[PDB]
Design a protein around this ligand. Structure first.
Ligand SMILES: CCC(=O)NCCNc1c(NCc2ccc(Nc3ncc(Cl)c(Nc4ccccc4C(=O)NC)n3)cc2)c(=O)c1=O
Length: 258
């Protein structure tokens, strides 16, 4: 139906980040049914050239409907242009993992990997290639719930990219699977970035030498083995996301009954 929201139904609040287009705020949305709802508000500092690209990102999220992908709520298309998104109260995943490193049990880390794999198996089933899977693009809705962030605000990430993406600019769901392996490593490392202190240009040579990100401390070997399957050099030998989801379900259940 209609995605336009009357500005008077939005109470703007504090800033919580930025983007290619401007600051992101949190706020409150009063609709006739379910008021009042907590939301994120994307703002655009500048034009009509930028207005074009800004609102196309909202269009992009319109096609998706998954419990572990942030929802588009609506848009305000008169200046100042706003995009209204579902709020993930607890913010960016990397910061959350760093702050709560010694307060999070392993079962929660595995839960986050599983939840993200369900979102990515959904995108794979829609034949949608993401190209920017990384912990920096995950949001924390609750201590038991993470979500892929807005795809526009997700937008080279060499240290996450599959070799065929680095070498030949090939992007498929199988190259997404490689990136997801790196994302899983980031989670089990409590938000450390991959290949710290390594130059981007040196990454592909290490991959082609057979080198891989090592097993994170306290990571179950079955889960690290799953990561290494995402990093098969030949993309046809990587699991599909629906297989990763099935394997993550059993790893999760063995760690803690759901
Ligand atoms: C409470 C009032 C206040 O002043 N708080 C200051 C903030 N202090 C702290 C935290 N919260 C930051 C924070 C909080 C909530 C979000 N929820 C959110 N929800 C939906 C989208 Cl769509 C979104 N989008 C994005 C927004 C920004 C950046 C990227 C995306 C994105 O989508 N990336 C893929 N971000 C994102 C970031 C901490 O944690 C912490 O400390």
């Amino acid at each position: 139906r209609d995605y336009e929201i009357q500005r008077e139904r939005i109470e703007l609040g504090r800033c919580i980040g930025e983007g290619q287009f401007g600051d992101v705020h949190q706020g409150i949305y009063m609709s006739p049914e379910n008021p009042a709802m907590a939301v994120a508000i994307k703002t655009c500092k500048n034009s009509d050239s930028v207005r074009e690209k800004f609102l196309q990102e909202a269009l992009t999220m319109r096609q998706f409907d998954h419990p572990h992908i942030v929802k588009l709520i609506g848009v305000i298309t008169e200046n100042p242009v706003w995009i209204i998104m579902e709020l993930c109260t607890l913010g960016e995943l990397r910061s959350f993992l760093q702050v709560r490193k010694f307060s999070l049990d392993l079962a929660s880390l595995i839960l986050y990997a599983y939840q993200l794999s369900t979102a990515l198996a959904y995108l794979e089933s829609k034949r949608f290639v993401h190209r920017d899977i990384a912990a920096r693009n995950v949001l924390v809705s609750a201590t038991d719930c993470v979500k892929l962030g807005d795809f526009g605000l997700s937008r080279l990430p060499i240290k996450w990219m599959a070799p065929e993406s680095i070498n030949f600019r090939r992007f498929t769901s199988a190259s997404d699977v490689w990136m997801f392996g790196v994302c899983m490593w980031e989670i089990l490392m409590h938000g450390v970035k991959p290949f710290q202190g390594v130059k981007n240009n040196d990454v592909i040579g290490r991959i082609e030498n057979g080198e891989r990100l090592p097993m994170p401390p306290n990571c179950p070997p079955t889960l690290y083995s799953l990561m290494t399957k995402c990093w098969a050099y030949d993309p046809s030998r990587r699991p599909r996301f629906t297989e990763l989801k099935a394997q993550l379900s059993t790893i999760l259940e063995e760690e803690k009954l759901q």
